[PDB]
Design an enzyme around this catalytic site. Structure first.
Site, PDB file in Angstrom:
ATOM      1  N   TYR A  93       0.796  -1.260   0.140  1.00  0.00           N
ATOM      2  CA  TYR A  93       0.014  -0.042   0.003  1.00  0.00           C
ATOM      3  C   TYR A  93       0.931   1.200  -0.042  1.00  0.00           C
ATOM      4  CZ  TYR A  93      -4.193   2.702   0.755  1.00  0.00           C
ATOM      5  OH  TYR A  93      -5.288   3.239   0.620  1.00  0.00           O
ATOM      6  N   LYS A 124      -3.389   8.653   2.596  1.00  0.00           N
ATOM      7  CA  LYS A 124      -4.698   8.409   3.311  1.00  0.00           C
ATOM      8  C   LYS A 124      -4.618   9.049   4.984  1.00  0.00           C
ATOM      9  CE  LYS A 124      -7.249   6.184   0.303  1.00  0.00           C
ATOM     10  NZ  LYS A 124      -8.492   7.056  -0.411  1.00  0.00           N
TER      11      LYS A 124
END
Lengths: 249, 249, 246, 246
Positions: free
Chosen positions: B155, B162
Site C-alpha cells: 500500500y 490516506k
C-alpha cells in the site's frame, strides 16, 4: 422506516430527557417494535407510560446487578419475542463519592468493583443471557463517553469502567460476529439537560458549535442497530460534534 | 427516504462495482438528487449513462489535479444548483510503481507528491471551491483505508496520503463546523471485485466473517451525508466488519 | 554512556535553543559521536560552532528539497563514516501564509505540496539515500506534534504533513525492521504565550517539556535501550494529550 | 547509571524468566536500589534469592487483593525507605476458566470481577497506599498487552481488565502529575508456539521482544530521562501492533 421488521429491547429509559428515551423515540419513528426494562418499583410506572406512547406493552423488570434477574427477564421477553434483533445497553453507574475530586483519593476497591460490574460487565451479561434468542442480523449497542480515552476531571473510576466497556464491544463483536451479530458503542458528547461551565466550554470548542442532543444520539443509535450499518462492528462511534478531535480551540 | 431534500455531488463513479457507484445508488434510493463528475473523455459516457439511471442529468468534467478545472466545474454546477448539501470525494491515486514491494525502495519524491496531491489535497481543494455554495446542514464525505493507521505491504505511499487525508477530515471539520458543515471519512474494508490471498485472509479474520460490500459502504455513506448523522463530524468511521479491531484471529 | 560506539547524524540544529540541539547535547553526553547538516552557507560557521561544543567537526551542507543534495551529503559523510547508526530528522516547514487563520481559506495546492515534501517526504528521502550505510542496530528518529492527531487552530496544513510523517514512520519501520533498523518519532509538546499558559495549566506534570526532556527521550529512542520499540509515536508532552477539560 | 539515587519497589518477580525480573535487573544495572514483594510464604526464600542477586534484602509480603496487606507492606517498607521513588506493577490474573474459548461463553461475573480487581484496581490501590511516601520526581509503571486495544482470541476478559488498567494509567497520571509523579505503562509484546511463530514472522524487527528489551524500556520510564513522558502506553512489541497483513 429503516428499522421495520426489527424488534429491539431498550434498557435505561428514565425520563423523556434521557439518551435511552431519545434512542427509543428514534427507533420507533423508524419502524422498530420495542420492549423496555425497568430497574425497580420506583421507575416502573414512568417506563410503562413511555413504552405505551411508543407502541409497546413489553415492560419488564431487570436488575443487571443480578444474574438471576437478567435470566428471568429474558425468559419473560421470550414469551412474546421468541427471537429478536438486539438491544440497547444504556446503564452506567458509580457510587456518588467516586466522582468528586482527585481520582486517586476518591477511588476505592468497592466503588471500582460496582462501577465496572454495572457499567461494563452488565453488557456482556445481557448478551450471554439472550444469545440464542438473537436473529442473524442482530445488533447490540452500548453507550460510552470520551472519559474512556482521556482523563477527565471528576469522571474518575467511570473512565476506567467505560474503557473496560469499549474493550467489551470489541471482544463481543469478535465473538458474536460469526453468528451474525454486530456490537458497537456510541461515545456521546455531553448533553445539555461544574456542569454549566463544562457545557459552555463544550459548545465553544465543538466543531459544530453546539452540544449533541438526544435526537442526534438517537438517530445514530437507530442507524447502528439497523441493517444500514451491516458493515460496522466493534466500533466506538463518536457522536460529540467533533469535540474529541480538536484541541486548543 | 432520509436524504429527501438533499443535493449531493458524487465524484469517482467508474463502473457499477465502484464504491462511488454503491454510494450514489444508496443515496438515490434514500431520495437525494445527485450530480456527478467525470475525469476525462474516456469515462464520460459511462458516467452519463449511470447518472441517467439514478435520475440525474448533471454530469460535469472535473480534473482535481487542476485548480482551474475544479472552479469551472463548480461554476457549471451552480447554474443548476446555486446551493447544495455536500459532496462525496472518492478519488485516490498513486503512480503504479509506488505500490509494489518494499516501501522505502518504491517511494519517490514525485510518486509522493502525486499521491498526496490527488488523494488528500483534492478533498480540501473541492471544499474551498464550493464553500459558499454549501447550505447549513451540508456534509462532506471522503473514503480512506486502514493503511492510514497501519503499515500494510504494498500500500506504501498511499498509506501516508490516506493519513494526510484523515487529518484533512479533522482540519476541515474543525474549520467548517461553525458554518454548519460536517466532514467525515469512511475507512472501508477490502471489497471483493496477491488480491485473492488478501481477501481470503480478510473473510477468515473479520468478526462478521465476510468482506463489506459496496452496498454496506453505500448505506454508511448515505447515513453520514444525511441529517441522521448531525452529531458526527471529523470522524473516520470503520466500515470493515470489525477487521481492524481484532488481532491474531 | 548508553550511546557509546554509536555514530548519529543530526539534522536541524540551527541554534542552541532548537529541539535538535537538545537532542544532540543529550546524545553527546551519552557517548555518541555526532555529525550535523546545515542548509545554506550563511549558517555554516554557526553550525561548526555548535558541532565543536558537541565534539564533532563533521558539518555538511544539505538541502533536503533536492535529491542530488541529499546524495552528495551522504557521499561526503561516507568519507568519514562509511557506516553509521542512524539519524535524527528535525525538519518541518510550511510557507507562513499556510499557518494563520481559517485552515480551509489558508491552504493552497503549493503550500500543501511544500509542507508534505519538506516535513514528511524528506524523512524517507534521507533513509533511501543512506540505507546501505546503516549498521544493524540502527535507529531513525523524527519529530512530530499533536496537530497530526487533532485539529489545532493555525497549525493548518502542518497537521496533515505531520499525519503523513507519522504514517511514514510506520511504513519505514515495517520496511526497514527486517534489515535491523528501527524507526520512531517523538510527538513533542510545545516548548517555552497564551498557548503556553494553557498548556502549563492543563498538562498533568504542570509544566511544558524542555528541549532537555525531548533530548533525553530521543537519546533513548536512538540507543539499544529501546531495541524493543519500532514504528512508535512516543508522546513527550508531559501527558497533555491524554487529558481533556483539565 | 541513569537510576542512581533512585529507590524503586518491584512487584511480581516470581522467577528469573519473569518480565519483572528483567526489569529489576535492568534497574539494578543502572544503579537503582530495589525492594521486592512476594504473595505467599511458599515463594519467600526464592524471592530473597532473587533480591540478593539484584542487590537487595528488602523482601516483603503483600497480597494486593487486600487493602490491609498493602497498607502493612508499605509500613514495613517505610522502616527502611521512609521515602522512595516509585514502583513497578507487574501483576495480572484471571481465573483459568476465563481464558479459553469463546469470550462471551467463557466470561462470568466473578471472573470479570477478579480480573479487573487484581489486574487493574491493584495498580491504584498501591498508589493510594504509598502516595505520601513518594518523592517529587517519582514514576509508577505498569505492564499491559495489545489485548487492551484489540480483541485477541482467548485473551478474553483480560483484554477488558488491561483496557481498564490503561485508563487507570491516564487517570492516575492526571491526578498525580501536579505532585510530581508520572505514571505510564509498557504494552509488551509476547515473549518466547504457533503464536510466537506468527509474531516473529510479522513483527517489523522480525523477532519477539525479550525481557531484557522490556526491562530497558521500564528502566527508562522510571528514570528522570523520561521526565517528559506521563500518562503514556508505550508499545514495546517490536512494531507488531502498527503493522497489518504482513
Amino acid at each position: 422506516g429503516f428499522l421495520s421488521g426489527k424488534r429491539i429491547l431498550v434498557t435505561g429509559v428514565a425520563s423523556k430527557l434521557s439518551i435511552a428515551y431519545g434512542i427509543a423515540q428514534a427507533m420507533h419513528r423508524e419502524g422498530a417494535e420495542l420492549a423496555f426494562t425497568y430497574q425497580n418499583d420506583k421507575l416502573k410506572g414512568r417506563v410503562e407510560e413511555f413504552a405505551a406512547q411508543l407502541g409497546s406493552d413489553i415492560v419488564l423488570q431487570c436488575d443487571v446487578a443480578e444474574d438471576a434477574s437478567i435470566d428471568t427477564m429474558f425468559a419473560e421477553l421470550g414469551k412474546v419475542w421468541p427471537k429478536f434483533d438486539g438491544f440497547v445497553h444504556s446503564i452506567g453507574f458509580a457510587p456518588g463519592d467516586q466522582l468528586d475530586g482527585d481520582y486517586v483519593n476518591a477511588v476505592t476497591r468497592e466503588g471500582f468493583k460496582i462501577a465496572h460490574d454495572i457499567s461494563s460487565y452488565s453488557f456482556v451479561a445481557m448478551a450471554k443471557a439472550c444469545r440464542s434468542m438473537l436473529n442473524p442480523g442482530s445488533a447490540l449497542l452500548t453507550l460510552s463517553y470520551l472519559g474512556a480515552e482521556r482523563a477527565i476531571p471528576n469522571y474518575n473510576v467511570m473512565g476506567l469502567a467505560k474503557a473496560s466497556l469499549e474493550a467489551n464491544v470489541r471482544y463481543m463483536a469478535n465473538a458474536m460476529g460469526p453468528e451474525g451479530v454486530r456490537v458497537n458503542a456510541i461515545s456521546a458528547g455531553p448533553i445539555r439537560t461544574d456542569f454549566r461551565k463544562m457545557l459552555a466550554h463544550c459548545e465553544a470548542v465543538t466543531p459544530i458549535r453546539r452540544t449533541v442532543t438526544i435526537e442526534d444520539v438517537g438517530n445514530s443509535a437507530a442507524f447502528l442497530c439497523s441493517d444500514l450499518s451491516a458493515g460496522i462492528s466493534g466500533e466506538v462511534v463518536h457522536v460529540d460534534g467533533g469535540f474529541s478531535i480538536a484541541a486548543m480551540n
